[PDB]
Design a protein around this ligand. Structure first.
Ligand SMILES: Nc1ncnc2c1ncn2[C@@H]1O[C@H](COP(=O)(O)OP(=O)(O)OP(=O)(O)O)[C@@H](O)[C@H]1O
Ligand SMILES: Nc1ncnc2c1ncn2[C@@H]1O[C@H](COP(=O)(O)OP(=O)(O)OP(=O)(O)O)[C@@H](O)[C@H]1O
Ligand SMILES: [Mg+2]
Ligand SMILES: [Mg+2]
Lengths: 349, 345
């Protein structure tokens, strides 16, 4: 009856996500505004309140997809996730844009009224970016073609969704009040921002030589992202315009990674503890080991996904012989094991 | 009594700002269509013909907004479509015949009313063929759609599902309107309007300072320019009158903030009112927002990003704050060096 305040929504997100406060507020505000719009569906005012789509930009592994999954748990309206890569322009073998609404209907029991007020997430939106360098000779059905088909969907159109099979009987869903959240790990966008901001070049005496250290980081550059930068990446102005709200996720730091190992509800350390717990052994990760794991992952530049690789390598040998071993009760992992100067100590008993 | 074009233009002003040619062409076109409906019999020997309109304008100019406003004050059936979803006959994609099907549904299957209506086709620039060269690989969503609509816009008989008795409907008296952004058309116009731009003393070098703007450049658009951008000449003929919207200016944007009946400021003010808090937008703050919006190049759509960006923090914590009664948005908040003043009741 009472719409949850954004603070409560953010608290729930923190249970699974660690950091990205700016993105959390945008998502919480969007849900609060969407709920208010739904609660005010009768338009008890003198205006036709519009929507504001979000664009979750950030380095791979920052938690863009994770946020969408967590939102679907605390959401009250229908929710659905999509993949821009499979989408293709109408009239081709590839999947059509209208398929997104079909999935949303399944979550709403094929209720047009319910599906007309849900939320939708489109992951890998950066992949459909038009190949600006490529000549405008062959229609980019997989890229620019998909963006052009989503212009009316985001703004609002009577999408034709199949009526659960086989012309006629085609359902008519209006995507006017549906909220869309696009996400994608834009690769190379930082360079575009650097040229527009750094503007450091030249070889002559009257030039401005810049040191490699003065160069900013991807996170810093991405923070100062502007729509002009997206145009060079491959996004048409008609597409970015429909997405006025833009959120940026910073690059997880070493300290933040240490929290990911445990703080998240399904944190990496907890996942491996259950694996060992069901087998009858206790798994403990020393705080010192977590620091080394985070440091190694910081170099792989693979986000939180790099943490799993470090744990697997350290526990690869243990998981190969531990099941055959007997009387093993607990396994302790120290920083030395992460570096390779020791092996996990086995507490027999 | 049929309404005069001035009345139609006045209604469009309530929701649109800074668009004279668009309103005039639409009002005149609608006025002519209304007169044709009044004399549908056309007893007079002369067989009065129709003139379709083509809308050209940058993003956030009001092309899709004008069509929506027209459907409210209109009396005959109206329909909106998307050229991207359309495809030539015999393919999984949507067919052009479905356009009349939606129009027929809006008239409760009234063929008489369907034969006299208006149809708006958005994203017409999308179907534009990538290149004017021969289509080695048939463009199902490109030339195919244009060729399929050649007879529909000009006028012919179309077969639509009854509800294989495909109901026959004539499209000779139905008005069709097309709209698109045509990203890059300005370059084509410049290549034609501007010539002799190369290296040399006798050549001309604008330096980008004197170069014509996108808005005025499109105002000088000619049919030949559209051919280079990619469009079948047969399709251009079906659209004799071409309306070109101008890029909104800083002053024009400031008016769109509040003048529209459903302006952005009003929408945000109503949103806070529904929660229980009052919102006030200062005139000085509006100008600052317009300046930043004019730099995004996204048209009116950029205003929503600036407003929500400044109110992002406020809307996140305002629902928790108690006793707050009104918020004052000053120009300092727009730049980001200040926080919206909070008034505690
Ligand atoms: N802040 C975070 N808190 C908790 N887990 C996180 C966080 N960031 C990333 N993860 C982990 O990331 C994994 C999911 O990948 P994630 O959603 O981060 O990728 P992505 O950035 O959306 O990918 P893409 O490269 O396709 O754009 C999950 O295991 C989740 O635990
Ligand atoms: N002059 C204007 N006054 C008020 N609102 C405007 C104006 N121009 C655009 N808008 C806003 O534009 C939105 C509707 O989209 P619009 O018709 O501008 O699209 P467009 O620029 O033609 O898009 P595209 O060319 O990509 O199809 C509405 O939110 C409307 O408020
Ligand atoms: Mg992802
Ligand atoms: Mg439009």
């Amino acid at each position: 009856s009472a719409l949850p305040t954004p603070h409560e929504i953010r608290n729930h997100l923190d249970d699974y996500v660690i950091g990205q406060e700016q993105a959390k507020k945008v998502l919480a505000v969007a849900v609060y505004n969407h709920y208010k719009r739904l609660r005010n569906g009768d338009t008890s005012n003198g205006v036709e309140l519009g929507k504001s789509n979000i664009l979750l930009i950030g380095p791979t592994g920052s938690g863009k997809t994770l946020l969408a999954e967590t939102l679907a748990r605390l959401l009250d309206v229908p929710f659905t996730m999509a993949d821009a890569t499979t989408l293709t322009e109408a009239g081709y073998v590839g999947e059509d844009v209208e398929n997104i609404i079909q999935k949303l209907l399944q979550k709403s029991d094929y209720d047009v009224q319910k599906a007309q007020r849900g939320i939708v997430y489109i992951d890998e939106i950066d992949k459909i970016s038009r190949k600006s360098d490529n000549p405008s000779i062959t229609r980019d059905v997989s890229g620019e073609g998909v963006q052009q088909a989503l212009l009316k969907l985001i703004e609002g159109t009577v999408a034709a969704v199949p009526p659960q099979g086989g012309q006629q009987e085609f359902l008519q869903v209006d995507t006017s009040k549906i909220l869309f959240i696009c996400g994608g790990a834009f690769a190379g966008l930082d360079k575009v921002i650097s040229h527009r901001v750094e503007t450091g070049s030249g070889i002559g005496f009257g030039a401005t030589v810049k040191a490699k250290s003065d160069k900013a980081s991807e996170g810093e550059l991405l923070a100062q992202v502007e729509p002009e930068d997206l145009i060079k990446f491959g996004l048409i102005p008609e597409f970015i315009g429909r997405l006025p709200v833009v959120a940026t996720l910073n690059e997880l730091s070493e300290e933040a990674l240490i929290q990911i190992l445990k703080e998240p509800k399904n944190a990496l350390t907890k996942q491996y503890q259950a694996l060992f717990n069901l087998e009858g052994v206790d798994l403990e990760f020393r705080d010192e080991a977590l620091d080394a794991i985070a440091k190694k992952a910081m170099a792989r530049k693979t986000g939180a996904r790099g943490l799993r690789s470090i744990v697997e390598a350290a526990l690869l040998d243990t998981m190969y012989d531990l099941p055959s071993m007997e009387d093993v009760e607990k396994v302790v992992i120290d920083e030395s094991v992460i570096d390779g100067q020791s092996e996990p100590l086995l507490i027999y008993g």
